[PDB]
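Q: Give me the 3D complex with fe (iii) ion.
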Amino acid sequence: SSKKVSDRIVRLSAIDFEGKKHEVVGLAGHTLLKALINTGLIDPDSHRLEEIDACSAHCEVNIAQEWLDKLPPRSYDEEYVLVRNSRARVLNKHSRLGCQVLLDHNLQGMVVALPEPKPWDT
Amino acid sequence: KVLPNSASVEEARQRVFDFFRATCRSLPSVMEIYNLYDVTSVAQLRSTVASEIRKNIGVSDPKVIDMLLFKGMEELMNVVNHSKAISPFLKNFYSSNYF
Amino acid sequence: SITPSPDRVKWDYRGQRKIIPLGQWLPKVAVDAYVAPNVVLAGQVTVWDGASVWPGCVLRGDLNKISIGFCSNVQERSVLHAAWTSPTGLPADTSIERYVTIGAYSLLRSCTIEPECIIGQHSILMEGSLVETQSILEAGSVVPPGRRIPSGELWAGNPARFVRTLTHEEILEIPKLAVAINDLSRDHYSEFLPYSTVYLEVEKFKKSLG
Amino acid sequence: KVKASTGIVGLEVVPNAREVLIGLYSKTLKEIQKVPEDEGYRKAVESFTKHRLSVCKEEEDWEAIEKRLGCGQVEELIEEAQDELKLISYMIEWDPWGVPDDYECEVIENDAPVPKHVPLHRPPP
Amino acid sequence: DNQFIFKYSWETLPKKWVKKMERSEHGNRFDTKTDYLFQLLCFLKLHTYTRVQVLIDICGVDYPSRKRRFEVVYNLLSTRYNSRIRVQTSADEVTRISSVVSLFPSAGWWEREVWDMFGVSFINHPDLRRILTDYGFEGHPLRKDFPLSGYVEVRYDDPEKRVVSEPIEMTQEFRYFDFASPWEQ
Amino acid sequence: RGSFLDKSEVADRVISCVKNFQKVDPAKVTPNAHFQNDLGLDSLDAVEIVMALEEEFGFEIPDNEADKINSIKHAVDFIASHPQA
Ligand SMILES: [Fe+3]
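A: Here is the predicted complex, encoded as structure tokens.
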């Protein structure tokens, strides 16, 4: 009952666009977007407010099908954002927004993929 | 880049593994270089490279191993740059005197 | 044997500079924020609007970033520092979110204080520690590195220990305290003109010398 | 006066050649103090560095120091001093001093004559 | 002539690596170990009174009788003091000797030429590809055991519509004439 | 639509790739089998297996990750978790 932080630590992995393997550490209850931003493979200024309204699919991550069964399914707003903010207006069926991925020990060890970054300045 | 001589059998083995990796990654380029797709069998080519490495096990000198790897890398670069029942005795006997 | 330097400044005719930029890192202070003249902000220090950095304290963010949020109060003679990496593998920059009151002799290093927090004096937060949102630590509490203070709780003791949960009425008073020290800081702020008159004194000294 | 050009395209004329040479020679002596005294390299370095420092201290004009030294091109002298600093740093980085014991060196001397018309580098006057 | 900086070197150079020295009118000679050749050339190039700052060339000599058949020779020149010096070592087929490309940038092509002709590999060469012989050459031509006419020859193969390489079948074999006199010794 | 290969397809492809070796046998190959012990192979055999897998799946495997592919289960997990396969 020491109430440390190592219990809340959730360790997962991320392969970015060019294929480099990365180790991502994030607290339980803090989103995958926040964990990736802290790791440094997502531009912090690109995505600041962890909200669906402020998300423009700049937090999109592709997750394996055997990991999609461990987190809640995509909401209608998330699916709409993925459909609209894409190169082609299709659903990738393996990608979820990093804002709605609430990290937990169930998802500990999950492997995600960071697609090619998109511009966000104006 | 050329490296100093390997001072350990483990280092020589690691260099051999790196060279085999390089050959395997450079194999598909040889496909478009030579165009023998009918009877190439890329898997058979990999098996032949492994067989060459396995027939070169009698060597135990790390210096000889490093020299062999250097020459193998040179040969890889050259190939990338496109530079190409009557017993055995009786056949040679019928062929010529010098055998 | 040690060799004293003859050209060593035993009197600088000016105290410690309030802002010490290291390399390209310039400490940033919001115009609304109040930092006392006695403080020393060195390196990667970022003080946002409404902050109340009180006299006698020091913020040395040379190793890693130090951030003071909106209406955050850091009181007199406290020390704030950071370092590369932490025992928890989380980012080790010192972050203090909005509506956080921090007592007099607080020793903060690589802490991650979430918004709306109360921290008493003589409180020490070593590397990797985070005090979650809406939490209180009383005076003298020291948290070991990597220890966390859960949200909605009161903690105490030289080794940090949970005392009791916080009622909603007690929780709502943390922003009130933050804005109260903010108002006191605003009262302190009005006594300083944009430019000091000490340059007249140094010119008088130069004229006296020649 | 000032040197319009040093002739060498790579070399460039330096105004404070005397000061640069003085500083380089002082640093040369300070660095060569770390070399063992028994070594002939240290003795030779101290000899020529002290001589050059003395002459460049006594003579003020760069023309005068060039004329007295006899090597000329204070820019070349500065380059030589910098190379000497680099060599001293290298011989501190690796330790070559001291005979390895049980050491043999084969000095070979033959007086086989050569004709006067073969290319032989004549000694400077 | 001009044996000044040679004697000065032997006076100032560390005695650890001077395996042997030769004072000759055909050229002053230093013979050292392959471990300390780079350090020796760095000392000579940088020292203020032995400034051999230009590398004339690097050569190889084959001596099949010796245990270390290859002899790597470095001819260097000092334009500041106007004298030539020679520094050589002994290397065999497998061992790799230190490279002096970092000191003298011109040494790259001569070291590649030495590799091509003899097989003496260098440790720190930026690249060590063959320079002079044909692409895919198998042997080292300047070795004494290497035949003068080589092992393969090229010709145009009409069915292949390309120049192919085949084992040598040359007519008018080389006629080695033994002119050596038994009284020459 | 679709960024990762199906787990069953990856397992079948990896099994088929392993089956195509002369030294190995279909009887002793299992989804959880160590290359050195269960399949009775060598270091060069494991390296060639990894290279064959990466050639079949069309993406380069990093050095350390390839070194950690000493089992069919590890290979399947890595291939199914990689977006470039
Ligand atoms: Fe998002």
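A quick observation: The first helix of chain B runs from residue 9 to 34.
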